[PDB]
Amino acid sequence: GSFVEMVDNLRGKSGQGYYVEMTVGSPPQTLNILVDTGSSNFAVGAAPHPFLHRYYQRQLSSTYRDLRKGVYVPYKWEGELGTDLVSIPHGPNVTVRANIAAITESDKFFINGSNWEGILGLAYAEIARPDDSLEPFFDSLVKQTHVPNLFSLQLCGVGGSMIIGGIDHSLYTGSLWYTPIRREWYYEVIIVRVEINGQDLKMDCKEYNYDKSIVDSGTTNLRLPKKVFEAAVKSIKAASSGFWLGEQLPVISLYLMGEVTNQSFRITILPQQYLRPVYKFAISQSSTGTCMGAVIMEGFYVVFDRARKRIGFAVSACHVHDEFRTAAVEGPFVTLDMEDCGYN
Ligand SMILES: COc1cc(Br)cc(CN2CCC(NC(=O)CCCS)CC2)c1OC
């Protein structure tokens, strides 16, 4: 119902993702940790990298255990794997034994000037490194505690909330609308229709999910596939008459597969969401598929209902809106052949 302790527990810089305070080891070592639904490793700085405010000092932790194994993660960082006791101060009052990759070497990972020292992957074991046998933090948390298999994110344009183990109904207006998680690797969803200011792109819905479509807190932009990206910008440029290519400095609706056969709902983002104050055009091309980043997520309260293999969307109580236009989650809509849109 209400999780006052966990409200406003996220911070960050625009374009750099959101981080939460966590503790590792015994006695607890406090670190700021990126919240990433697009990856599945819990990894922290473990050596005195010049950019870092602080780092995990294994020698100070009585509860640390070595797994005597190494991990190389390119996007790069490299680490030594182990386990230790982990807590989230402004989260549930629990302590779990989780896997931690102690980052010993990295290139273009840590950001000069940033206030975070690690990454928390909230996605599933499938995309975990080195392989799926390394249990992600959230999978460990659910198994070792009575914390429900669910988390939600209210990312605001920089602070936000990560509600672990439930939903805070103060953080959204209207109703929650759910889309199925297609496969438990990334938080994979299916987009069935795309409108630019009320007009359908008339594109094959297979193109909207070319390779995959994901909800990703680790990505800043709405990243559309090349073919969709091209057609989207074409309608975006026509609606308002280098920059469009992300080389320099009208609402958008995505229809998502519903819970029921032939039933969909739409989520609608304003310019106030895809114009990121630096302004920059926060919609870019991709070759890995559709990535619903902070652009999408900042308009909505997002429920990662892992228990029921679904993701909830509702209008965020903190989203930037004026007296003219407001962000929206609306349904139900009738959409046939939705299963076809999934790439195989
Ligand atoms: C500031 O730097 C980061 C902040 C945060 Br929060 C997370 C990361 C790492 N994260 C790794 C997974 C990526 N997503 C995918 O591979 C799916 C394709 C999406 S189009 C997104 C970036 C970051 O990079 C190091």
From Swiss-Prot:
Reported induction: Up-regulated by the Ca(2+)-regulated transcription factor NFATC4.
GO biological process: amyloid fibril formation; amyloid precursor protein catabolic process; amyloid-beta formation; amyloid-beta metabolic process; cellular response to amyloid-beta; cellular response to copper ion; cellular response to manganese ion; detection of mechanical stimulus involved in sensory perception of pain
UniProt PTM: N-Glycosylated. Addition of a bisecting N-acetylglucosamine by MGAT3 blocks lysosomal targeting, further degradation and is required for maintaining stability under stress conditions. Acetylated in the endoplasmic reticulum at Lys-69, Lys-202, Lys-206, Lys-212, Lys-226, Lys-227 and Lys-234. Acetylation by NAT8 and NAT8B is transient and deacetylation probably occurs in the Golgi. Acetylation regulates the maturation, the transport to the plasma membrane, the stability and the expression of the protein.
Glycosylated residues (UniProt): 93, 112, 262
Tissues expressed in: Expressed at high levels in the brain and pancreas. In the brain, expression is highest in the substantia nigra, locus coruleus and medulla oblongata.
Phenotype when changing residue 211 to N: Almost abolishes beta-cleaved soluble APP production
Protein name: Beta-secretase 1
Keyword flag Methyltransferase: no
Ranges in the topological domain labelled Extracellular: 1-344
EC code: 3.4.23.46
Organism: Homo sapiens
Entry's free-text remark on domains: DXXLL motif is required for a proper endocytosis and retrograde transport to the trans-Golgi network, as well as for regulation of lysosomal degradation.
Primary location: membrane
Keywords: Acetylation, Aspartyl protease, Cell membrane, Cell projection, Cytoplasmic vesicle, Disulfide bond, Endoplasmic reticulum, Endosome, Glycoprotein, Golgi apparatus, Hydrolase, Isopeptide bond, Lipoprotein, Lysosome, Membrane, Palmitate, Phosphoprotein, Protease, Signal, Transmembrane, Transmembrane helix, Ubl conjugation, Zymogen
Top-level EC class: hydrolase
